[PDB]
A paper describes a structure:
Remarkably, the quality control system is equipped with an elaborate backup mechanism employing a molecular ‘gatekeeper’ that can specifically catalyse reglucosylation against incompletely folded glycoproteins as potential substrates, thereby regenerating monoglucosylated glycoforms for their return to the chaperone-assisted folding process. This gatekeeper function is executed by a unique enzyme, UDP-glucose:glycoprotein glucosyltransferase (UGGT). Our results reveal that UGGT has a modular structure in which the 35-kDa catalytic domain is tethered to the 125-kDa folding-sensor region.
In the CAZy classification, the CAT domain belongs to the GT24 family, which is supposed to share structural similarity with the GT8 family. This was confirmed by the present crystal structure showing a GT-A fold comprising nine β-strands and 12 α-helices. The UDP-glucose and Ca2+ ligands were accommodated in the active site containing a DXD motif (D1294-A1295-D1296), in which the ligand binding residues are essentially identical across species together with the retaining GT8 glycosyltransferases14, suggesting that the enzymatic mechanism of UGGT is evolutionarily conserved. In comparison with UDP-glucose-bound complex, 1379–1387 and 1427–1438 loops containing Asn1386 and Asn1430 located closer to the glucose- or Tris-binding site undergo significant structural changes upon UDP binding, suggesting its mechanism of release of the monoglucosylated product.
Residue numbers in the entry: 1190 to 1379, 1385 to 1466
The structure:
């Protein structure tokens, strides 16, 4: 397919949002799209509905059955296991026939043609991530990456949010980035695994910083930049603690539209 998107998450609300993420992608492209999931992290109900969603919205999909290898230290906590599946297996989840894959968070709403991200020049980097926004200045106290360990360690590189990333799998494989990430994981495994690990290894495994418009989250990013945002992440706000759905329905007018459309499809599938 032209566009290849990977997502992984757990839970009922995240499955509901995952369907909305997929629909949002299809509403903004005419290029072909394949979604890649990890079989064990989708509920039976989700897996039964998926072929119906695919036929309605004109995408293909694959459920991968890759299991955490015995030689790699596991994670007892589900959230951390899922973070491992996001970042530790990019060279092994996907076949060598695949040139590129994009991780999109299940809570995202896309407002752009994702083929633009496929075509974006990564300047030799094995992957590209969006920097955390500086624009909402009133949240500076929560920008942990601008002080202490991160300020000195980054030596002027951005700290990037892990909600969205494009992986040039040819470059990633050539650099043995998967081995390098797993190697650092083993050393460090003796906080936010999916985000801290790639941000920590930029000197060895570089990140191309995507233009800021690629990922807007209200927590970090100014109101004025919503109108130009290509994708929205519903990232949590440590100040307000505003609930996830309230953020979704408040921030994103089309969220309800997509949710309703999918629900109506489910009603018809069940009626038949
Ligand atoms: O019901 C849930 C709740 C969370 N998660 C996952 O748990 C992590 C934390 O997510 P969440 O509590 O919703 O916070 P967010 O603020 O949306 O997460 C932001 O920060 C995380 C790193 O801390 C990144 O993984 C996300 O991409 C980024 O959007 C993420 O991997 C989620 O996908 C689930 O799978 N199911
Ligand atoms: Ca998110």
């Amino acid at each position: 397919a032209d566009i290849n998107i990977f997502s992984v998450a757990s839970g009922h609300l995240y499955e509901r949002m995952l369907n909305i993420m997929m629909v949002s992608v299809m509403k903004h492209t005419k290029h072909s799209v394949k979604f890649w999931f990890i079989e064990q992290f989708l509920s039976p109900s989700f897996k039964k509905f998926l072929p119906h969603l695919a036929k309605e919205y004109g995408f293909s999909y694959e459920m991968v059955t890759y299991k955490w290898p015995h030689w790699l230290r596991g994670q007892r906590e589900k959230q951390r296991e899922i973070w491992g599946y996001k970042i530790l297996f990019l060279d092994v989840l996907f076949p060598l026939s695949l040139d590129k894959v994009i991780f999109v968070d299940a809570d995202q709403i896309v407002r752009t043609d994702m083929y633009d991200l496929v075509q974006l020049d990564l300047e030799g980097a094995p992957y590209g991530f969006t920097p955390m926004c500086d624009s909402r200045k009133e949240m500076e106290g929560f920008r942990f990456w601008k002080q202490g360990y991160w300020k000195s360690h980054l030596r002027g590189r951005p700290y990037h949010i892990s909600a969205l990333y494009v992986v040039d799998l040819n470059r990633f494989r050539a650099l043995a980035a998967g081995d390098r990430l797993r190697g650092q994981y083993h050393t460090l495994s003796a906080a936010n695994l999916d985000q801290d690990l790639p941000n920590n290894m930029q000197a060895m495994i570089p990140i191309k910083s995507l233009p800021q418009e690629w990922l807007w989250c209200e927590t970090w990013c100014a109101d004025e930049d919503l109108k130009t945002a290509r994708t929205i992440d519903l990232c949590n706000n440590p100040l307000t603690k505003e609930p996830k759905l309230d953020r979704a329905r408040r921030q994103v007018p089309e969220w309800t539209e997509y949710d309703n459309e999918i629900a109506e499809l489910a009603v018809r599938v069940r009626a038949a």
